[PDB]
Design a protein around this nucleic acid. Structure first.
Ligand SMILES: [K+]
Ligand SMILES: [K+]
Length: 149
RNA sequence: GCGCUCCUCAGUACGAGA
RNA sequence: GGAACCGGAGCGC
């Protein structure tokens, strides 16, 4: 499967924010999540960690936010995330950087951590079910949108 | 002693718009 | 997302 993300990137010349299209292999993205450790932000980079998707630890909407629909049960299931995402019955979503070249993000990188880019592979804790690839609408921050495929 | 820089503190406390 | 205080060095005065 091929996923397409649209990311706005600043042009240093025109100084205007321009659209950038980015293609990612799903296999590589899943591979990225398999090789990433299964902890919630306890690496030097802080990745991977909890992707709330608009919810709080008790699986209740946050009000004002609209969760992304991944189209899969385990994924769209409201989260159960404890103080450090290690609850024995915890279940939630993780986000980890993913790129077009598909290389594994150096999760232990720090000061400075490797650039995480705009895209993230989203998957479940603790069975790493693939949910999708999202990407910040503009820059490497702000609103995260579901990409196409 | 005053001003600026870097390391560290620390991906911590704090947090959920990441 | 993400500080500061305390802690150590450099440059200038
Ligand atoms: K400092
Ligand atoms: K200091």
């Amino acid at each position: 499967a091929t996923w397409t993300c649209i990311n706005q990137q600043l042009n240093p010349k025109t100084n205007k924010w321009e659209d950038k299209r980015l293609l990612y292999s799903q296999a590589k993205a899943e591979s990225n999540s398999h090789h990433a450790p299964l902890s919630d932000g306890k690496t030097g980079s802080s990745y991977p960690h909890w992707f709330t998707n608009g919810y709080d630890g008790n699986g209740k909407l946050i009000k004002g936010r609209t969760p992304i629909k991944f189209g899969k049960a385990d994924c769209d299931r409201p989260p159960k995330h404890s103080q450090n995402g290690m609850g024995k019955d915890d279940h939630y979503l993780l986000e980890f950087p993913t790129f077009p070249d598909g290389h594994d993000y150096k999760f232990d990188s720090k000061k400075p951590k490797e650039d995480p880019g705009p895209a993230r592979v989203i998957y479940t804790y603790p069975n790493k079910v693939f949910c999708g690839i999202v990407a910040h609408q503009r820059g490497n921050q702000g609103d995260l949108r579901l990409c196409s495929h």
